[PDB]
Amino acid sequence: TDNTFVSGNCDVVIGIVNNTVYDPLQPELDS
Amino acid sequence: TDNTFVSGNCDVVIGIVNNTVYDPLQPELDS
């Protein structure tokens, strides 16, 4: 999440693809 | 916070205004 920013939506962006984005907060808070 | 940075205080900056700054960790911490 620190290497990218959220904007728009996946239904308008051209050439968008599907994958996973690592969130460092989840492993740290759940541990 | 990700879109801004902390420096100085509110008594030095001229023309500063008061508003709430969103914290991305707030929803995660409460979860």
UniProtKB/Swiss-Prot annotation, chains A, B:
Q: Which domain of life is it from?
A: Viruses
Glycosylation: which residues? N18
State how changing D2H affects the protein, per the record. In strain: Alpha/B.1.1.7
Instruction: State the protein's purpose.
Output: Subunit of the fusion protein that is processed upon entry into the host cell. Mediates fusion of the virion and cellular membranes by functioning as a class I viral fusion protein. Contains a viral fusion peptide that is unmasked after S2 cleavage. This cleavage can occur at the cell membrane by host TMPRSS2 or during endocytosis by host CSTL. In either case, this triggers an extensive and irreversible conformational change that leads to fusion of the viral envelope with the cellular cytoplasmic membrane, releasing viral genomic RNA into the host cell cytoplasm.
| Protein name stated in the entry | Spike protein S2'
UniProt lists the gene as S
